[PDB]
Amino acid sequence: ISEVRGNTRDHRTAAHTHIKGLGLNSSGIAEKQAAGFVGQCAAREACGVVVDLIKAHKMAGRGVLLAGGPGTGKTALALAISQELGTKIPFCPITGSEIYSTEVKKTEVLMENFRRAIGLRVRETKDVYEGEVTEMTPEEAENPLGGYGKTISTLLIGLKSARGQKKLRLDPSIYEAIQKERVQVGDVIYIETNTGACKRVGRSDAYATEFDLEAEEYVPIPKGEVHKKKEIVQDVTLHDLDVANARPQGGQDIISMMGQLMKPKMTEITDKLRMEINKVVQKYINQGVAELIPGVLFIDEAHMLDIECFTYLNKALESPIAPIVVLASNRGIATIRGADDLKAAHGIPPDFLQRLLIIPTHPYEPDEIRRIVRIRAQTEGVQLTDAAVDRVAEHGVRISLRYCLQLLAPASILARVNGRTQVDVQDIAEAEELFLDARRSANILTSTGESGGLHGFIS
Template identity: 70%
Template sequence: MRISEVKSTSREQRIAPHTHIKGLGLNDEGRAYQQADGFVGQSSAREAGGIVVDLIKSKKMAGRALLLAGAPGTGKTAIALAIAQELGPKVPFCPMVGSEVYSSEVKKTEVLMENFRRAIGLRIKEIKEVYEGEVLELTPEETENPLGGYGKTLSHVTIGLKTVKGIKTLKLDPSIYESIQKEKVTVGDVIYIEANTGAVKRVGRSDAYATEFDLEADEYVPLPKGEVHKKKEIVQDVTLNDLDIANARPQGGQDIMSMMGQLLKPKKTEITDKLRKEINKVVNKYIDQGIAELVPGVLFIDEVHLLDIECFTYLNKALESTISPIVIFATNRGMCQVRGTEDIIAPHGIPVDLLDRILIIRTLPYTLDDIRAIVQIRARIEGLDLSEDALNYMAESGVKTSLRYVIQLLSPASILARTNGRENITLDDLKEVDDLFYDAKSSAKILAEYQARYVS
């Protein structure tokens, strides 16, 4: 009998083009290291990005815009993602592409406004009566079905909670057990249950289990202090778009969206300017009372030249709003026609009146050493072994073609190496793959030579 182990793939992370980017790679003085946090080169652009991060954190950048301009493959998207990494998970970061606004169902300006409000966070602080502690016991109790038959129904749930000061056993309603299941709570997790609403929140895994080999634990937290039953400041993070949707389609629930949903009583309404103004009024009222704090995030619009004159006019107005995120544009175009016009030629395809509001960061082509270092990082991230001459060949090829092209050669070259019974990628593997595939420049050259053979 043959027994083989089945390898789990549930925790395997997809390797995306910018998986290696972990931050801007700056020192304490805001100067860029030549190579850090997955970044190589682009020192000036990264240092400018660091200043932008400081402005966002100090809330002095709201309503302003930034443009990352440079040739294709010079790290524009990487810098935007690095800014998001530096800001942390609590600051909203909403990426989109210029072409997303063109839809037969929704107006272009509506798509822009939806993304604008998705990039604006609201941090709400409330003092609530809660039961908090480490879960010691979680036992659902069943009873005979009152309607008869063979099935059983859930009568209540017994849960034991432990803090530094003591242990308490609670008997919970079956509806709360549904919330516990949604949060995927298990014994050893630290949770809190709101006394008034029954809402359940998983805080993390108890640090008493920190020595165990637990891949599923997202964060270890200390055992809560004080009694199990107490008053606690609860912080909830939502976006303005979450509030828009909750009020447009009010539903019963246990969180802040349901509370804000009491603004309007109709069962279903569209997200109109009137509704958004009403939500803004309540948000401003909460901010004035000190209950809530506005967290301006980042809206990243890649390929901004794909927007048309109507969108640019709308952006001009939106950037002047009192509630507005920082907007980061990215483009690889030079002087070109503004979409939606017949004769307006402008830098980057953006109207001059909008360009006046924008800080522009330029990204420069990578040098031979930069490309070599980036290829090395990508190979390490993808778990590939490159020989020294193969690495040099890719760096030289990257200067002649593009960084994106040579990085794309890594995967097919690794497949070719494995086919030949090797784990490491050699120069011969890369040359063979390079002969099989064409880069953009080579393809354009062939098209020009054999233009007569193609259908025009």
Template identity: 65%
Template sequence: MKATTTIASSSSGTPVAHNAVPPSATSAARANRVAPHSHIKGLGLTAEGFSAGDAGGFVGQANAREACGVVVDLVKSRKFSGRALLLVGAPGTGKTALALALSHELGSKVPFCPMVGSEVYSSEVKKTEVLAEAFRRAIGLRIKETKEVYEGEVTEITPSEAENPLAGYGKTVSHVVVGLKTARGTKQLRLDPSVYEAILKERIVVGDVVYIEANTGAVKRVGRSDAYASSFDLESETYVPLPKGDVHKRKELVQDVTLGDLDAANARPQGGQDIMSVMGSLVRTGRTEVTDKLRREVNKVVKQYVDQGVAEVVPGVVFIDEVHMLDIECFTYLNALLESPMAPTVIFATNRGNALVRGTTDVVSPHGVPGDLLDRCLIVKTETYARAQIAQVLQVRAQVEGIQLGPGVLDKLAEEGERASLRYALQLLAPAAILARMAGRDAIVIDDVDEMGGMFLDAKTSASALAQEAGM
């Protein structure tokens, strides 16, 4: 098969040719894309809660990992809501990695809302609104609803037409007959014309597996029946097995939302379909400040759902990195948020020692956090990495990024990490690999690391050079 070429216009209006990329190349490019913490898979603890050595992508930090493991158990048992965990330690010791590992341990169904302390200084909404919104987005609501549905493989779609009473000529669809088949039997349904419009919108044809809600008439296409699957089919199609049981059944549907989603949905004004309403929605700003009255009404409805057994509240986690960037007003508001009935677990992280509390002129407190908020926190300290541990971290990152290290390179990079910082040593990996590839080598050699050290400065060397220039 020949590679096709498509013509697209660049931003300047000049036609640009793009060679079509095979799906395999695209998927390989996505697989090689890594993030700073893509090697973190969890806390790496045993079933008893002890550190399992260098597991889960972590190296060292045994005490901090075990402490976070206890917090995970507290969150799962719903006994840590409204409390706070403070991670303190030098830069590059894994505070953010611990918070991400904690979210991995809790699972994808538990809301995890990360933010940085400086995000609250927004010109669109108040500082307290940013914090309240983050807290609401970290509280999940799992709604369970039992619906009567018709489910099966479509065997027939026959619209029935009738004369349109509003027009002298032309016809309109009066009803549609849909045939559904399951492993147990078949059934013909006589449905409303609105269902036929939904079928056309979903592009449903004979052979598709669908389910239709009995009460609302909503139609959902699940996929193509695997009876139509063929090894020569080039279409990107999802094949599903033929449904079991009867065509008409009761099905439990579970939907996960957050209180922040409910707030935003109720705060957004619902305009009409006229041209002025549409244009107004286009020029309106994206951020809408939610009032406390609206949040109280949402909480009241949520409580009713929980009392009826329809919904379940799932407290999540708010992670605020660089918490010392918050000011005294934000800290005071955090105290109130932690005492609210619906409060998630809060994780703070900071690399400051004794520091001035932002927004004050004379209040110096440990980690730049006021004492009344510190009293609400369990504090976990991360340890500085030794040279051997720096080498292990570099080895893990090299494996994740697919970089081969030649003889002596790991020791050289570990030496640079001990002299400058772990982050500096990690940053040398990718450019050194590019330099090795340009030289026709698969592995990095020591000369590549030396050349990178001559091109890029670490923070300590740069600060030292500036101090020398200032003293001259």
């Protein structure tokens, strides 16, 4: 049906594709450049302890602040933390701007993400019989019931898979499932042993040629064993348990079915539900059938949170089940987003800041900027003459790190369209002239928009 593309796979490169980890010794000391990082040895070592905090299940509701100017690698450090944890531990990134939902109060939006950052791992065994129905045969009973004339003591079903077939002897009550489900010979079904009922996947595509037209799609014969008994490990967040309880999905009545045909509007999940969910979760943890695996809620531009968000986070972080929260901020001393009379450092209320482990991120030396240019070039696949490297690094000292990382691809285009397989000073000197930085542009504004005028900028 679909025409599979045989062409080679490759990965897009984004602003942080070069970062692969925190780059630490087994002693936890930062290597001066490793895993894509250059410098920030203090902040990487601190994040390494935070990583070991998260992997140790004693933590609940601790707070971290990544504090430092724009460009200083706070986003890179958060992503590196996430990569050090890996996919088995939740990392839930948001900005403060995402909390201003129109659809529920923002303390609900934040508590959703707070519970998204908390994972639950449940182990259960799946136990089914599974195949194409090869036969159905009633076993007439030894002692029939009077007045009925028919009495069946067993129904026998043949199931085949790709890997075998079995004669299956079933309690005759399965007649109810077969008759409702309209199971026929050549249909693919499974029998689940916790009910003894059956469900029909479809007709086996071995029968796809029975007619010139039949109104169903066929399905392949199951490629497993005819009997499955498997442990299954389910990734669950506690937010999944919130929604699954607060809006049940499978309801067969008109109001349920009309509900599932209309937009699944968020609702202000009660603390009573969440607190009972916690109690049943803690029960199953004590049974040992589930693991709690708290992860990371990361809030970037946390200075976009307002004082109502921060005061709720006080209560939230005090929960006995809670992720770690990592905050990033760049806002100096600034007015609290929802308390116009109050200024504080980082734009974080002094009440709340006292809870956080602050990690400072510092600027970069000229030689670190150069090393970052080397790492970024080989990641985007660009290759530079050393004089192009030094010119890119020089703009990085004079203007900004980000601006210079953004010159690499434009200059690579200009090089290849000039027939050069590597970029040189002539291309950098050309990329930097097509693509201005904010300062040179602001100078054009300041010179041209000194007044109103037919060709003036507008203000």
